[PDB]
From Swiss-Prot:
GO BP term, example: proteolysis
Cell compartment(s), UniProt: Secreted
Group of enzyme by EC: hydrolase
Name this polypeptide is given: Trypsin
Cystines in this chain: C26-C42, C150-C165, C176-C201
E.C. number: 3.4.21.4
SUPFAM superfamilies reported for this sequence: Trypsin-like serine proteases
Residue stretches making up the Peptidase S1 domain: 1-224
Length: 224
């Protein structure tokens, strides 16, 4: 997260860190006791055994409850950056309670309204290309950018109806590498997307691009 502030305990009860080979890698969202939603690109085709989920902590490396993975399912239409969601099943079930909870999802067919406020969180870099990552979870609030504007930045074909965009024209507030797969919520803390891709991090006039939960609810609901 670029331009972020520390998340408080209980801000995102459903957020999980996803380590790979013992190191930082991405984020995700706990949907129920045995299911995490993350970005497909975080997991597709990689050795499953390399991943460890941690829930209930502001840190990636201690606290809370961990699990390995039992299975990985990418969206059936995942291609390039498009449809960038995956369902992970956990080897160890994680109960709600305390600072752990399960995500409430954006309604099927919803699309974040341009200008509305969204909050994204993760353990990724704090600058483009940064090599260090924070120990504790960061968050940042950015407005939704219209898809039309987003297509003017990236190209018409590049932004699909399964993506939405968020950021500030000036730059300086965004998700970044290591935040992929983690949650972006609306102002009510409902899960509206997963961190997916973008042109660098926090650049002027290149929004962050998010996999849209509202658009991808059929997949999520079928396999959660």
């Amino acid at each position: 997260i670029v331009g972020g502030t520390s998340a408080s305990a209980g801000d995102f009860p459903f957020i999980v860190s996803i380590s790979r080979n013992g190191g930082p890698w991405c984020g995700g969202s706990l949907l129920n006791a045995n299911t995490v939603l993350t970005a497909a690109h975080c997991v597709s085709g990689y050795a499953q055994s390399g991943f460890q989920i941690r829930a209930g902590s502001l840190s990636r490396t201690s606290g809370g409850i961990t699990s390995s993975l039992s299975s990985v399912r990418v969206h059936p239409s995942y291609s390039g950056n498009n449809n960038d969601l995956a369902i992970l099943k956990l080897s160890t079930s994680i109960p709600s309670g305390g600072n752990i909870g399960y995500a409430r999802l954006a309604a099927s067919g919803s699309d974040p309204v341009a200008g509305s406020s969204a909050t994204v969180a993760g353990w990724g870099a704090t600058s483009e290309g940064g090599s260090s990552t924070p120990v504790n979870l960061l968050k940042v609030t950015v407005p939704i950018v219209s898809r039309a504007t987003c297509r003017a930045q990236y190209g018409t074909s590049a932004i699909t109806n399964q993506m939405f965009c968020a950021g500030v024209s000036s730059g300086g507030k965004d998700s970044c590498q290591g935040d992929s797969g983690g949650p972006i919520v609306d102002s009510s803390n409902t899960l509206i997307g997963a961190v997916s891709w973008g042109n660098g991090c926090a650049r002027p006039n290149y929004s962050g691009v998010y996999a849209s939960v509202g658009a991808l609810r059929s997949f999520i609901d079928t396999y959660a």
